[PDB]
Amino acid sequence: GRPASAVMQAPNRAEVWSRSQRPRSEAMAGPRFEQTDFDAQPRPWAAIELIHKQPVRWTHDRIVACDGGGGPHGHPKIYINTDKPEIATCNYCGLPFANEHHRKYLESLPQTSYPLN
Amino acid sequence: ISDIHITRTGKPLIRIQGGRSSLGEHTATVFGATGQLGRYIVNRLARQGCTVIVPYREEMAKRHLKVSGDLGRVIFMEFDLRNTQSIEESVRHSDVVYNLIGRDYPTKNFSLADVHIEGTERIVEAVAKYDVDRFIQVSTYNANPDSTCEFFRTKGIAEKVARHVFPETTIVRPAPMFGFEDRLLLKLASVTNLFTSNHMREKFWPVHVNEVGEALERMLYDDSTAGQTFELYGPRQYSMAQIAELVDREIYKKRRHINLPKPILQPLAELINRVLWWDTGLSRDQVEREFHDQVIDPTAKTFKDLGMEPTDISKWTYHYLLPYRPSTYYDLPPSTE
Amino acid sequence: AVQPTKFAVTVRQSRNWADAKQRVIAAYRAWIRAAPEIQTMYSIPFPVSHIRTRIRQEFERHRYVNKLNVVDVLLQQSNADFQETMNFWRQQSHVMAFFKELPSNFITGFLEGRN
Amino acid sequence: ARPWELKRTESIDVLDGLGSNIRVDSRGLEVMRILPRLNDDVNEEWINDKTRFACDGLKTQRLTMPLVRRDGKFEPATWEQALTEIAHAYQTLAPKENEFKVIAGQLVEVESLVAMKDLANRLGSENLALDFPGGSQPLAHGVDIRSNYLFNSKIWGIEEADAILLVGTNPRHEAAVLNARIRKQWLRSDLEIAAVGQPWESTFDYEHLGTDLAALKNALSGPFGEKLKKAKRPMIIVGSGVTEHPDAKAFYETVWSFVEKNASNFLTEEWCGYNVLQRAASRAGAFEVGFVVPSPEVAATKPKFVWLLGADEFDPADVPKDAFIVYQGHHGDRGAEIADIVLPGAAYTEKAGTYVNTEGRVQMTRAATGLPGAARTDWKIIRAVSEFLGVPLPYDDVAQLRDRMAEISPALAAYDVVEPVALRHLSKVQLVDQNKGAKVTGEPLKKVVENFYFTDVISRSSPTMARCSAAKETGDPRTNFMAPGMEEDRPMGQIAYGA
Amino acid sequence: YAFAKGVKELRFLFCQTSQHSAEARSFLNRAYPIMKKHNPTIPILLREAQGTIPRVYARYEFGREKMESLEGLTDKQIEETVAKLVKT
Amino acid sequence: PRNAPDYNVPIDIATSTFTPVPKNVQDGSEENVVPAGLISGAPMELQARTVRIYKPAKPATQSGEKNTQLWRMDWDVLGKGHRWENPLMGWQSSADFMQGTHLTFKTKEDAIAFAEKQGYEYFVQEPNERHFRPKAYANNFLYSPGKLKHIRTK
Numbered sequence A: 001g002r003p004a005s006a007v008m009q010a011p012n013r014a015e016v017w018s019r020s021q022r023p024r025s026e027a028m029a030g031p032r033f034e035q036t037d038f039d040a041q042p043r044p045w046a047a048i049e050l051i052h053k054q055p056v057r058w059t060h061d062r063i064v065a066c067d068g069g070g071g072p073h074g075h076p077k078i079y080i081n082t083d084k085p086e087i088a089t090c091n092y093c094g095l096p097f098a099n100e101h102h103r104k105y106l107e108s109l110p111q112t113s114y115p116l117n
Numbered sequence B: 001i002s003d004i005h006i007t008r009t010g011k012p013l014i015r016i017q018g019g020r021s022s023l024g025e026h027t028a029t030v031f032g033a034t035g036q037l038g039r040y041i042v043n044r045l046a047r048q049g050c051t052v053i054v055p056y057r058e059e060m061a062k063r064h065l066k067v068s069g070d071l072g073r074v075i076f077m078e079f080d081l082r083n084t085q086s087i088e089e090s091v092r093h094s095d096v097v098y099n100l101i102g103r104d105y106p107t108k109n110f111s112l113a114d115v116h117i118e119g120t121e122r123i124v125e126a127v128a129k130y131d132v133d134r135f136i137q138v139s140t141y142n143a144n145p146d147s148t149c150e151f152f153r154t155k156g157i158a159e160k161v162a163r164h165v166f167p168e169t170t171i172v173r174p175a176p177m178f179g180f181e182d183r184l185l186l187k188l189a190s191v192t193n194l195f196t197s198n199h200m201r202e203k204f205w206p207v208h209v210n211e212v213g214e215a216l217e218r219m220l221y222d223d224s225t226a227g228q229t230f231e232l233y234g235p236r237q238y239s240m241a242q243i244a245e246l247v248d249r250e251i252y253k254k255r256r257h258i259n260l261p262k263p264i265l266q267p268l269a270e271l272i273n274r275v276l277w278w279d280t281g282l283s284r285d286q287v288e289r290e291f292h293d294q295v296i297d298p299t300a301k302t303f304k305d306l307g308m309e310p311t312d313i314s315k316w317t318y319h320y321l322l323p324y325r326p327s328t329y330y331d332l333p334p335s336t337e
Numbered sequence C: 001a002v003q004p005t006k007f008a009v010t011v012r013q014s015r016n017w018a019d020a021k022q023r024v025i026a027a028y029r030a031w032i033r034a035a036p037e038i039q040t041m042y043s044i045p046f047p048v049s050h051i052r053t054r055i056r057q058e059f060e061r062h063r064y065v066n067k068l069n070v071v072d073v074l075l076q077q078s079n080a081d082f083q084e085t086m087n088f089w090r091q092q093s094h095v096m097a098f099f100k101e102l103p104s105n106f107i108t109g110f111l112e113g114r115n
Numbered sequence D: 001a002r003p004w005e006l007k008r009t010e011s012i013d014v015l016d017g018l019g020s021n022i023r024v025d026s027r028g029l030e031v032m033r034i035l036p037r038l039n040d041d042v043n044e045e046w047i048n049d050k051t052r053f054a055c056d057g058l059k060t061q062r063l064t065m066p067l068v069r070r071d072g073k074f075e076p077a078t079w080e081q082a083l084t085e086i087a088h089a090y091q092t093l094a095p096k097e098n099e100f101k102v103i104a105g106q107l108v109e110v111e112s113l114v115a116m117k118d119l120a121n122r123l124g125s126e127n128l129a130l131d132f133p134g135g136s137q138p139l140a141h142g143v144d145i146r147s148n149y150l151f152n153s154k155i156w157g158i159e160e161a162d163a164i165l166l167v168g169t170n171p172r173h174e175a176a177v178l179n180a181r182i183r184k185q186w187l188r189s190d191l192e193i194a195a196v197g198q199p200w201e202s203t204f205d206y207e208h209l210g211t212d213l214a215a216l217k218n219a220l221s222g223p224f225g226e227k228l229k230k231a232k233r234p235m236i237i238v239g240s241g242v243t244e245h246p247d248a249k250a251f252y253e254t255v256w257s258f259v260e261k262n263a264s265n266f267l268t269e270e271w272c273g274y275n276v277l278q279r280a281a282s283r284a285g286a287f288e289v290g291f292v293v294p295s296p297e298v299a300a301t302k303p304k305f306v307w308l309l310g311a312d313e314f315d316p317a318d319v320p321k322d323a324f325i326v327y328q329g330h331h332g333d334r335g336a337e338i339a340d341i342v343l344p345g346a347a348y349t350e351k352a353g354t355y356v357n358t359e360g361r362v363q364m365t366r367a368a369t370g371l372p373g374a375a376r377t378d379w380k381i382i383r384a385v386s387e388f389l390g391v392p393l394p395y396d397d398v399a400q401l402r403d404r405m406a407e408i409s410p411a412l413a414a415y416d417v418v419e420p421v422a423l424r425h426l427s428k429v430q431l432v433d434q435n436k437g438a439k440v441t442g443e444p445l446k447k448v449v450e451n452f453y454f455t456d457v458i459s460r461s462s463p464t465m466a467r468c469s470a471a472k473e474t475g476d477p478r479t480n481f482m483a484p485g486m487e488e489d490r491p492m493g494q495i496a497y498g499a
Numbered sequence E: 001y002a003f004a005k006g007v008k009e010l011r012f013l014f015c016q017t018s019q020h021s022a023e024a025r026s027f028l029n030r031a032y033p034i035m036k037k038h039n040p041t042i043p044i045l046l047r048e049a050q051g052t053i054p055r056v057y058a059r060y061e062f063g064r065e066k067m068e069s070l071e072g073l074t075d076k077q078i079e080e081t082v083a084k085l086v087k088t
Numbered sequence F: 001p002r003n004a005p006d007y008n009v010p011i012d013i014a015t016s017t018f019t020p021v022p023k024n025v026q027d028g029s030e031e032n033v034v035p036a037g038l039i040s041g042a043p044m045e046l047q048a049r050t051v052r053i054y055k056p057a058k059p060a061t062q063s064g065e066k067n068t069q070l071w072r073m074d075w076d077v078l079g080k081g082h083r084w085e086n087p088l089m090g091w092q093s094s095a096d097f098m099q100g101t102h103l104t105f106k107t108k109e110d111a112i113a114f115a116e117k118q119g120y121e122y123f124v125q126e127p128n129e130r131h132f133r134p135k136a137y138a139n140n141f142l143y144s145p146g147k148l149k150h151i152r153t154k
Ligand SMILES: NC(=O)C1=CN([C@@H]2O[C@H](COP(=O)(O)OP(=O)(O)OC[C@H]3O[C@@H](n4cnc5c(N)ncnc54)[C@H](OP(=O)(O)O)[C@@H]3O)[C@@H](O)[C@H]2O)C=CC1
Pocket: B031, B032, B033, B034, B035, B036, B037, B038, B056, B057, B058, B080, B081, B099, B100, B101, B102, B103, B104, B110, B115, B138, B139, B140, B141, B174, B175, B176, B177, B178, B183
């Protein structure tokens, strides 16, 4: 566990993002890792950090439709209620929605989950 | 023997016993495992689900070892004796380190002193550096720092170096070994071994290599074997003449030898070893051992201290010499004379 | 039709217990007669006494059978195992898989894990 | 999990005394969820939340290796070097009669108690205690007649009950799915309930008659006694908290005297008005085989070797400071942390153990998973140490021990059924004849369940119950209260569950 | 008339049914009160189960135990049958 | 001697460190039972291991009852060897060769007959039956002359 490519869980995020995720430092150790190039190992980006750099899709309708934007390529079409003063998230892809009726409340919170703008 | 092993550093090992898919919980490193003995210790450790690091030099000669264990079990590391890092990288995840590195004859880059003393020095110093639980170093029979045979002297000084650095060393002294691919029975059935200095009358207590790999496995589990010294010899004493008699009775060939006077043969043997690249069986010191005789040094534990009773070489001549019977006598039963 | 092989024996039912009695002796005799011939075919390094010991034990495990229709299945299996062995269809690993070269107490079993 | 990848095991809940029939869903090494399964005689397709949601405590604080206390630290031991260390201590102490003491906990099964009774008996001890307070002295009800300590009108008997008196028990926190059956009968019929003890927030209506024996005496002499007298299928239910009380001696004679006075109502051809409600799975089965302190002479002999057989809620006065403590169990909790040697045993999702519920139904678990680490079966541990101590026990297999079990009480060989108490009226002797002059103190009845979510080692180690208690303390209705998920005050979420 | 010193428990295994004669239940009906009053410190475990051959156990010191069937015995013959067990 | 572990039972090629000690095995002398397990070729471990014979209860999560129709025979989990974690990937290893197998029978008697003939140890549990009770929609609205014990909400 000498390099950062053998400790950081992902290049974009250092810590684990699941209850059960074995830390990289705890899985790059052992005899099987003694003559190994760490940066040559598969080290993919954490999707938990990426999805949360998306900005909120603002809408006035009570109910929004998300199908993943790909048409048949995306995901099954669903509908998200936006009534709670909170950013509503698509359960398949994580895209954030908010209703403009909470624009003043959300732009008052000390922090949030997604970029409001 | 149990489902719980506790090591000298005190870590526990909760084991699931059988098969190559199970959990032996032990991480071993076996230096010198691509030789003759090394496979039997590696197969024993690997087929009971233990992780085995196999430091190797030539890539193609290590390959038979991977079959011993499951996926991820046998880990190959490429090392050199004079590459301390590769030595340290190989023993630092381990709870036992086997040192089986030896050579009968000098080489252009290793003397007997360089491969035995200095090789053990680096291996033991890494065992000390990373605090590995167990260290079973394999010396030879008749090992003595006061010896005059380079083999018996240099392997006798490495014995003292190992203890001086890591006192809990299990020192193991096997007798000349027989088995499949042994340099005992297969040479007496060969045709190259025609030269000889004595009349093949030197005596020793030959030991099955299979029972020595088993003995090394039991020393890992019997923790009380740490810091001890083991001489692992067979049930009978024979000369090279008595062994060669058994071989002839088995292969049905009646091999012959050319005897030379030692002041004549020894200089030549030192030339063949210096002018040929392969193991020729002939060298100045191997002639000197040829005139020496085996002594079982007392105050040394035995097979009985592992609770093992070795078998006689005679019972094994048919199994290992049958490839060398001529077609006319091949279909015959074992000699059992 | 196609020829039955060298030791092929037609599958027939035992007429009575006397029939079965005589067949089982014939099968045991034929096995122990062949033990010297098994040893050199398969390069067995043990002596023939051990091989015949194992033949005896295989027959002894079916000692206490009092059913004609179970004996005849058993006389079938030995006929096929004899034919298979003598024609050298099986190899040394199969014949050595047949020679084995559980804890003896509760406390021994307990201390090592179950067995 | 997905349901097609789940192995389904039909077992018994041991987290209370009802023996609710459950389905244990496992994916290999790990239990995934606990489901109810139909038993109209016992649980009626319902389980409570602790039975349901505490399974995650089966994977968290487990004992997998023998530990010997050395220099104030717990170090790993081989099974041999732990049984030898136990045997050496016993040999050194030379315990005479009843200086060997055994305390059994809530989750112990009958294959362990019958095995432990046979070990202690041959060591010279009859000192066989129980984990509750007052579990180390003779009990107010004895164990000679089974009707002394059972729910004699069945759990199915509440389906007909017309009048029910409660004596010192909160039926919600003791038998939650039995509490529902009372409500069901109450909504659809003219069932009258009164209670003596601490008031509790109830799912049914009841009359609070008082908190102590004086109130109970007026209760039977007053209108509810006449209601109990006049009714068909009357029902007095004594909680195990009474048996824990100072005046269990006096409470149990008062109730039975009312019953015997009022047979042909209470003791008819087909009815038994007398019930004792157990809140632990091990306790009726303990009574079934005599695993109970017989006399105060035994209880007054200070032990020097104490085995805690799954015991963790033991009173600190029942364990000597200088005694050699051996703890056997599956969780590292209050019992394991005061012992000299710990022996890892099995949990109920990994053993086939017999349990007897509060009414005397004999049920068996089925192992959903194998043993973790180096844990053993508990009755094998007890049998193993009987070798080391010098008195090996005859049986070497579960069938041989279940043959032993069936000649302590033959009902233990009849599974899934409840045997009828033949000599029902013999309950007068230990209940009244043996309980006549009692130094009544007047101390009111207690609330023996302070926290429903924490009642045993498994629950106290469950992250899910830890969230149930904490949310109940502050009232946070939020789903992700101490769980993964995004919140307004938690923009980034958390991986922690239970914290 | 209490027991002999040494009996640590009594254990009767009978059945509710008349499949076996009512004599064990008749003896226990009468015996258990007085046979518990004279020596309250000893457990006399009355255990019954359908189709149980009547039988009695006395457990003695250091784990030893004596069994005797009660099958075919009468309420008097059963009385001496227990009597030899707790008299010495 | 009263169901004893026989420690002299011979071992065969299939006995491992997870094979139970057997109380008894078939030898073909037994009355009226075909000794199939003696001639089947299965190891002796099949006669040291108890099976469970039962009708699976309905899952709590569904109302369909088709998996409750028949009798199922499974093999009990042993204390060691049922599952352990592979050091390499974390996959779940096993040494129990009966863990993924089950038999289905039309009647309870068929299951007993098969287990007797195969030499299995076997335990039967009987299915818990539903207690019938008439259900009337009109109970939802019954008149109450006195205090409403609860307020129904439909
Ligand atoms: N076999 C016998 O009759 C007896 C053996 N012994 C000792 O037992 C041990 C094992 O015996 P056996 O297996 O038969 O011996 P082998 O000679 O067959 O094996 C020796 C091992 O040492 C390694 N080795 C030798 N020199 C070096 C070096 N300079 N650097 C790195 N590795 C080196 C070899 O690796 P590589 O193959 O890559 O060269 C080989 O794996 C040896 O130490 C031997 O001296 C003692 C008494 C009798």
